[PDB]
Structures are given as structure tokens and as C-alpha cells.
Design a protein around this ligand. Structure first.
Ligand SMILES: CCCCCCCCOCCOCCOCCOCCO
Ligand SMILES: CCCCCCCCOCCOCCOCCOCCO
Ligand SMILES: CCCCCCCCOCCOCCOCCOCCO
Ligand SMILES: CCCCCCCCOCCOCCOCCOCCO
Ligand SMILES: CCCCCCCCOCCOCCOCCOCCO
Ligand SMILES: CCCCCCCCOCCOCCOCCOCCO
Ligand SMILES: CCCCCCCCOCCOCCOCCOCCO
Ligand SMILES: CCCCCCCCOCCOCCOCCOCCO
Ligand SMILES: CCCCCCCCOCCOCCOCCOCCO
Lengths: 289, 289, 289
């Protein structure tokens, strides 16, 4: 069986004083198509393959291509994936929950470098022999994630730096906890990064969370992000404040809202301020198909 | 929801004396696949996204890729589109109705340069930041079309020439009228082009039309195309004669036929003569899937 | 109508002493997606178009694109195809039946060069004007195949070498016979290649075959491949031995097995030795979707 799903989004993206002779406000848009082939067996083992075709405004050549494939095998809650895999530090819960606006962004997201599923081709040739192995396991609200990424599997392994990550999250109705650790993140020797997060559902309607990061070799240093969101009918309000250790950095903050227009259609906007005082704002719509 | 539709065509394409050491007759063929994602809401607003994957014989690399995306929102007869849009001068009725043969061509089509939906990627980099906005509205047999195309939306707007177009068409059972006007067509300063057309259904079976064009900065000058078609059961006969103002140009003319083999399958051919005395002929088949 | 089908495969590929500073064992994987548009008529004539999107580990840019299109028309057992066609020497029965392992390979396959369906784009530009015509006809267990491939249909034909192939196969329940001949194979003057094969079903369970080849201008010279396979429930065992005329060459051989895990899911492995003493081994899985 082959299925196709995806989403389109479009809207206004504003970057205060973007650059000499550049428009500060542009129309930023994305089309994402996922192609998923699955083979289900009577033994209870599923086999799957996936490809993505994603286009963003500004993409080179004004064209769209597929990325590199991802393969998986699932049995009894355990999934093993190979090729262009989802990594542990990118897949744990909570770590991206401060994101807001129609482009789902936040200065409160981790400021480190690490491997993650590659959405598109890479014209530099850097990903041509990149291959990962991932293993996930979900047991009674607890998820274990493990990933191993080799940037160039064809070359002798003592000559390449491979990335190893581990993560877990846990949740009941009110509290969630998550943690992740990745060594030699992004293929960079000694770039060991870590994440510890927690969130509290303080109402059926609202949540408050705190994420902490060790950003490894990044200049940001350790980081803390406090965020919250509250739902009023179809409207959700979101906010966050984030601080990094880099000397002289400002406190980053953001405020936004989402409006659930219909099933599959979400209108969102945000106003945010970064660590170097950048001022960014967005307003747009996402529709899932 | 995601749907896929398209067409294939193949046949013989003849160009008298095409070039030194070149075959005059080649097998010309096209495969077009449209990928359309749509999100329908109970509020009566539809959201859609589309991508095209088109291959033509002779295409570089012997490969096929997707183009840049187009997004739209529709409500109550009004449609607003963004990104790789259909433009007013390209979408009005009547303007392409002299086309014939299996490749739908005619020297009687407008000889000007103007923006239009881009079917494929562009390796030059010219379309990387191209973005348009279009608005259509159909009211009781009358269609209004408006388009705005910015060739590079990232650069300050006083440094780029944007294209603005407007068009309308109107029809009852017997007569149709259409007009279009576009300023700075194709992003070229002062290339202001215009179109006025009319057609008369003089039988259930036949139609005769006249299209007039102001081709802006093109060397063709003003142009007039007289065309007609007549259906005899499953066979349609078509003809046209076109004249341009360019000094020394010949009168262009064409004669062709279509045969509706089955629903979705059309066999067509034509013999045509251009403004510089070029002699072209084609015979082939198109099938819709 | 448009349909999508394909397969994914992944596994371990071992090449003894692959190269200085190279890993001998890598994870080799493939994703293949076929897009087929078909138009069926009440006259009994079917029209179809196909495109392929295939990704393999190691592919340049870590991206996937479509190949060049293939078109066909079918009526009463006869099929005529145009564009990126299947060729006679590649489509006859028996010629590939010694293949084994999850990558379906064998040193006992023909060692000649010849045109065949192109699975992907070609960045060299060599296939940009490549166009073939093929005609197949299946009559009571007998298949006739004819193919004509012009490497560059735009250039005068006396300047290009075109490939012409013919083939036939025939089978009853117990015996199969096949033969093929192709002149100027692969567009190389005087590279005339030929194949004669036969197979004997010596049980409901097992088959033994012999393929003979004239490899044209290849350095391999004439070649003979003896192969056999035997099925024990869901497990199939396969073997082959092949010899070429090239002076000094070793006898190539291979042993492997397939295990039919479920409908659409096959686990296969092999150990093989080539004409230059190369040692190769594989183990992996293929799943069809
Ligand atoms: C195989 C799938 C198609 C992907 C191949 C595209 C290869 C294009 O580039 C060739 C090398 O030239 C460099 C391109 O410029 C950078 C492209 O990507 C960046 C923005 O989207
Ligand atoms: C200085 C911050 C405001 C940016 C003003 C520049 C105006 C240009 O419009 C850019 C489009 O950006 C959309 C912002 O408006 C939506 C606000 O956010 C909603 C929650 O408070
Ligand atoms: C012909 C239009 C005037 C030319 C100015 C172009 C300026 C661009 O944007 C103006 C707003 O219109 C278009 C964008 O679609 C996104 C709107 O916001 C999303 C839903 O809340
Ligand atoms: C991103 C989707 C894939 C489209 C990228 C293809 C980029 C290829 O070119 C890289 C630059 O080299 C120039 C190519 O030659 C012209 C190609 O198009 C013309 C005929 O179809
Ligand atoms: C000089 C005009 C005729 C072209 C003769 C060259 C012959 C080569 O065949 C090219 C294939 O072109 C197809 C034309 O035949 C179909 C005719 O048009 C039908 C309506 O009158
Ligand atoms: C082996 C064939 C002889 C090699 C000559 C190649 C010459 C090419 O064209 C000959 C005609 O056949 C093929 C084309 O398919 C399109 C036919 O017209 C369309 C339906 O009316
Ligand atoms: C038009 C569909 C996209 C296919 C175009 C890709 C063109 C990329 O290359 C541009 C020229 O540079 C050379 C590329 O390196 C070789 C690529 O293929 C070999 C391994 O998969
Ligand atoms: C020397 C031949 C054995 C190769 C040993 C190297 C070991 C590395 O593993 C490579 C993965 O290859 C899979 C082979 O094992 C499956 C055997 O074939 C099955 C039928 O006899
Ligand atoms: C974290 C794993 C240890 C890193 C070593 C990477 C070595 C790679 O392969 C080890 C085996 O695992 C993965 C491959 O999936 C294919 C297995 O065989 C197919 C079914 O019989």
C-alpha cells in the first residue's frame, strides 16, 4: 500500500532590518508531500519506506525533488529504522514545545548543532553516504529513543566521527518529563549535548514547561527556556522567555496565538525577539491534506 | 485529500529544414502529472496546493522534477492564489483558441512576452524568488482575473519591475467576448500588452473568432488572428490565418483536425506556415488519465 | 487512472577488500516508486505512461528524481512502446534467472554492454535525446520482442549508431527456451551480442538451466552459465557456476537462499565469487508495496 499526505502553509514573514536593499517583509510558503509505502504481514511485522518532497520559497532552481529514503520494520511496539532516520535528540517530547507562529519557530529551541531527519537533497554532496540506524520503543506512556548516525558509511570508521544519541520521555495526565543526550552531535568531535525538560498541565486548558540544555560546543553555552500556553475555545495563546550563557546576550522572548479555524486548518501568528535583539513577526495559515 | 491526474502525448513533429545535420522529423512526447492537495472545511472555504511534474523529449538530464508550488484559498466564487500563479493574460478565454495539432500550437497565438504559470524548475536561478498573487472571480458567466507577479520578492521593490495584469471574459450560448491588459509584462519596463477577442457560435457545430493583440515591445507589432473550427461527429476541423505588423512578414496560416477516439483520447494533426515562412507539421495522440 | 506501486529493500553488502580506507561491509538500500497513468477505452485499446522515482544508497546529492517517460499503446496482445523503452535483450525470459541474494546479482549474468530501460536521470547529458521504439507480442506462451533505440534522435541518422534487437521465448510446463540477438548493442559499432538459453523444470519444486552468450566486443568473450534452484516450502536454494573465454579468468560461482516470510516480503542472502576472484556476500530483505 502507498499513501500520500502533507500540508501547505503560506503567510507573511517579517524580519526587522533584514539587510541592505532587502525587503523586511516577504511571503513565505512551504509545500510538503510525504510518500509512504507500507507492507503489513499476518505475522504482525510491518515494513515501511518513506520519501519526502518539500518545496520552500527561495529554494534553488524553483524546483522540488525527493530526499533520501528512510526504511523501517515494526513489531510489538519496537521500531527499527534505517537510512535517513529520525534521531533521538530531535524526536524526544517537550524539546520543541515553545515553538509558535505559522512557521513553528522559537529562539527558546536548542541552540546546538545535531543530526536530524534530512528533509531535502543536499547539493554540497555532504549527505551522499550518510546512513543512520534508529530504534524506538514505546512502553506504557514511556518512549525510549536510540539513534546512531554515520556521516559517511563507505569510509573506514576510525576516520569518521559517528553520532550516538539516546533519549526518553514519560507522561501521565498532568506531568511530563523528558531527557536526551547525544555525543559527537552533528559529527563534531566533543560536541556533547544534553536536554532535560518538564511540563505541568495545570488545567485541562493550560500548560507550563521548562527546558534546559547543554549546547555542547555552540557559543550559546547552557540555555533555559520557560514557556506556557493556554487554550480558550478555538484560540491558543503561547509565550516563552529563553536565556543563554553567552556573554552579552539579551533575553529572548515571544508571544503568539493559534486559531483552529477547522479540522486541518490552523491560523497562527507571533512576535518574537532574539538573543541579539533581532525582531521577527509572522502571520499565516497551515492546512493539512 | 491528495489527487493525481495528468496526460501523456506522443507523435511525430516535423520542422522543414530544421538545421544543419539535424533530423527534420522527430518523435516529440510529453508526460504531465499534477499533484493536488485540498483541505475542505464546513465553513465553505477550500484550501489547496498544487505541484506539477512534467517531462518533455529533449529535457536536460533525461529526468523529471517538480516545479514551484502554488497555493489557493476559495470561498463563494472568489479564489486567491499565491506563489507560482496563473496570470490574467494567460488565463482569459479565447486567446489560445486557434491552437491545433497534437502539441496545441499556432502562429496565431500572441507574439509577446509575459509571465505565466511555470511548468518546471529553471536551472538559471531566475525564478528562485519569484512570487505572484492572483485573484479570480466568476459571476454569472463573467470571469474577472487579476494577477501581480514579483520576479524577486526578496529585493527592495523599487529595484524590481513587477507585472500587473487584468482580464475579463463573458459568454452566452452564441457570442463570447474577452479582453486583457498587462503592464510591464514579463518584468520588462514598458512592455504593455493587450488583447481583445470575440467569437461567434454560428451553429451547434461551428465557431469563428477574431483575436487582436498589442504585442508591446515585441518586434511583431500589432497582430490579428482569424480562426474557425467545425465539428462533424467525432472529427473537428480547424483553421486560422494570422498577420503581424513587422515589415516583410508573411501571413501565417494553419489547417488541422482532431479525432475524438474515445473519452480521454484525442488524435490530432496539423500543417502550419509561419511569419518567416517556416513549415511545420505534426500528427499524434493525447490521452488523459 | 493513476496507480503507484514499488518496493523497498535494505541489508548488508560485503565486498572483500573493497578499497584502501574503505569499509568492506556497508548497508545497501533501495527505494523504487513506479507511477503509472493508464487510459482504457471501450474499443479495447489501452494507453499508458510510466515514470520511475528510484533512490539507492550513495546516490549523488542524497535526493531522488524521476527518470524519462515511457509511453505505450496495447491492443489484442500487441504492445507498442515509445521513449524510455524496455529492450529485447533485457526483456527475454531466462537470461537473468541465475540472480540471487537480496540485490538480485550474479556473475553468471551476461557480461556485454547493451541498452535497457533507464531507471534514473543521467547527469552527463548522454540520454537527453535518447528515444526508443519497442513492440512486443505474446501468442500462446510465446513472446516476440523487438526494440529499436536511437541514442540521439535529433541528429542526422547516418551520424549516429542505432541499436536493433530481437528476441523470443517459449515455455510449456516443463521446458523453456529463449534466444535474443542485438546488433550495435549499446550504440557501439560492431558490438553484436546474442543469447541462447534453456531451462528444465525437473520437479514441481526445482529447475536447472543453461544460458550461453556471445558478449560481442566485451573482453569477456563467449560465456556459459549453468544454474539451478530448488524450493523446500518457503525456502528456495539457488546456485550457479559461470565461465567466460577471457584468458586467465577464474570460474565464477554463487550459492544463496531466499525465504518467503510473507506475501510481498522476501529475505535473501548469497555468497559469490567472480571471474577475477572477487568475493562478495549479501543478506537483506525486500518488501513490495
Ligand atoms: C537528484 C535529485 C535532484 C537533486 C539534485 C539537484 C542538484 C543540483 O545542484 C547541482 C550542483 O549545483 C549546486 C546547487 O545550488 C544549491 C542547491 O540547494 C540549495 C537551496 O534549495
Ligand atoms: C514590530 C512588530 C510588528 C511588526 C510590524 C511590522 C508590520 C508588518 O507586518 C508583517 C506581517 O507580520 C504579522 C504580525 O501581526 C500579527 C501579530 O501577532 C499576534 C499576537 O500578538
Ligand atoms: C496586488 C497586491 C498588492 C501588492 C502588494 C504585495 C504585498 C503582499 O502582501 C499583501 C497581502 O496579501 C497576500 C498574502 O497572503 C497571506 C496573508 O495572510 C494570511 C492569513 O491570515
Ligand atoms: C531541485 C529540483 C531539481 C531541479 C534541479 C536541477 C538542477 C540542475 O542544473 C544545475 C545547474 O546546471 C544547469 C542545467 O542545464 C539546464 C537544465 O534545464 C533545461 C532543459 O530541461
Ligand atoms: C510538407 C507538409 C507535409 C509534411 C511532409 C513531411 C512528411 C513527414 O511526416 C511528418 C509527420 O507529420 C505529420 C503530417 O501528416 C498529417 C497531416 O495533417 C492533417 C490535416 O490536413
Ligand atoms: C523500427 C522502426 C523504424 C525506425 C524508424 C524510426 C522512425 C520513427 O517513426 C516511425 C513511425 O513509428 C513510431 C511513432 O509513434 C507515433 C505515431 O503516430 C501517432 C498516432 O497517429
Ligand atoms: C531534472 C531532474 C533532476 C535531475 C537533475 C540532476 C542534475 C544534477 O547534476 C547537474 C550536473 O552536475 C553533475 C552531478 O553528479 C552526478 C549525478 O548522478 C550520479 C549518482 O547518482
Ligand atoms: C567470506 C564470506 C562470508 C562473508 C563474511 C564476512 C562477514 C561479514 O558479514 C557481511 C554480511 O554478509 C552476509 C552473509 O551471510 C549470509 C550467508 O549466505 C547464505 C547462504 O549460504
Ligand atoms: C548501533 C549499532 C552498532 C553500530 C554498528 C553499525 C553496524 C551496522 O550493522 C549492524 C546490523 O544492524 C543493521 C542493519 O539492518 C539490516 C540487517 O539484516 C537484514 C535482515 O536479515
Amino acid at each position: 500500500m502507498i499513501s500520500l499526505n502533507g500540508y501547505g502553509r503560506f503567510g507573511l514573514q517579517y524580519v526587522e532590518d533584514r539587510g541592505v536593499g532587502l525587503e523586511d517583509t516577504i511571503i513565505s510558503s512551504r509545500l510538503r508531500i510525504n510518500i509512504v509505502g507500507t507492507t503489513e504481514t499476518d505475522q504482525g511485522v510491518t515494513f515501511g519506506a518513506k520519501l519526502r518532497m518539500q518545496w520552500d520559497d527561495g529554494d534553488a532552481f524553483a524546483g522540488t525533488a525527493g530526499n533520501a529514503a528512510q526504511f523501517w520494520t515494526s513489531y510489538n511496539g519496537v521500531t527499527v529504522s534505517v537510512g535517513n532516520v529520525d534521531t533521538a535528540f530531535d524526536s524526544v517530547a517537550l524539546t520543541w514545545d515553545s515553538e509558535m507562529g505559522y512557521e513553528a519557530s522559537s529562539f527558546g529551541d536548542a541552540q546546538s548543532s545535531f543530526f536530524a531527519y534530512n528533509w531535502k537533497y543536499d547539493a554540497s554532496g555532504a549527505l551522499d553516504n550518510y546512513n543512520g540506524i534508529a530504534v524506538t520503543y514505546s512502553i506504557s506512556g514511556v518512549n525510549l529513543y536510540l539513534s546512531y548516525v554515520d556521516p559517511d558509511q563507505t569510509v573506514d570508521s576510525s576516520l569518521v566521527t559517528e553520532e550516538f544519541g539516546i533519549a526518553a520521555d514519560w507522561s501521565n495526565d498532568m506531568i511530563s518529563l523528558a531527557a536526551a543526550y547525544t555525543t559527537d552531535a552533528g559529527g563534531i568531535v566533543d560536541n556533547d549535548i544534553a536536554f532535560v525538560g518538564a511540563a505541568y498541565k495545570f488545567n485541562d486548558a493550560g500548560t507550563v514547561g521548562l527546558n534546559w540544555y547543554d549546547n555542547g560546543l555552540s557559543t550559546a553555552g547552557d540555555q533555559v527556556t520557560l514557556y506556557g500556553n493556554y487554550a480558550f475555545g478555538a484560540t491558543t495563546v503561547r509565550a516563552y522567555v529563553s536565556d543563554i550563557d553567552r556573554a552579552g546576550a539579551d533575553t529572548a522572548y515571544g508571544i503568539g496565538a493559534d486559531y483552529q479555524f477547522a479540522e486541518g486548518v490552523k491560523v497562527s501568528g507571533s512576535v518574537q525577539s532574539g538573543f541579539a535583539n533581532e525582531t521577527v513577526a509572522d502571520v499565516g495559515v497551515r492546512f493539512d491534506f
